[PDB]
Amino acid sequence: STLDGATYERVCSDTLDALCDYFEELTENASELQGTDVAYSDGVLTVNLGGQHGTYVINRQTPNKQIWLSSPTSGPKRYDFVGTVAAGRWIYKHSGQSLHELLQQEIPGILKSQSVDFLRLPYCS
């Protein structure tokens, strides 16, 4: 393939909607961590983890049929989808790790209060 426009929109929506839900799950449980907030609109997911840890941005970029990521520690990446509507993952041309594996690497050390597993979410097969 590539995912055509309609399929990309469905897969991207499912991927990002679930990530938003999970980041809300993690940050609403971490009640002791102040200055955190999750915002989500227009295909842009914002995870502000405070003044020390910075802000993640994960967003749909429709013209490119990609998901873009900016991490306060590892910087920017553009992800393409590989797979089908049934199962797939988001991959970046200069890393072996999927989007969700990157978050699994970087987030647990920040949210030490939580048991973190991004690999249970849709579209990281």
What was the experiment behind these coordinates?
Answer: X-ray
- Per domain, the residue ranges of the chain are 1-125
CB 45 within 8 A of CB 57: yes
Starting at the earlier edge strand, list the strands of the sheet with 88-92: 36-41, 44-49, 55-61, 66-71, 75-83, 88-92
Cβ contacts of 29 within 8 Å, gap of 6 or more: 113, 114
Resolution in angstroms comes to 1.4
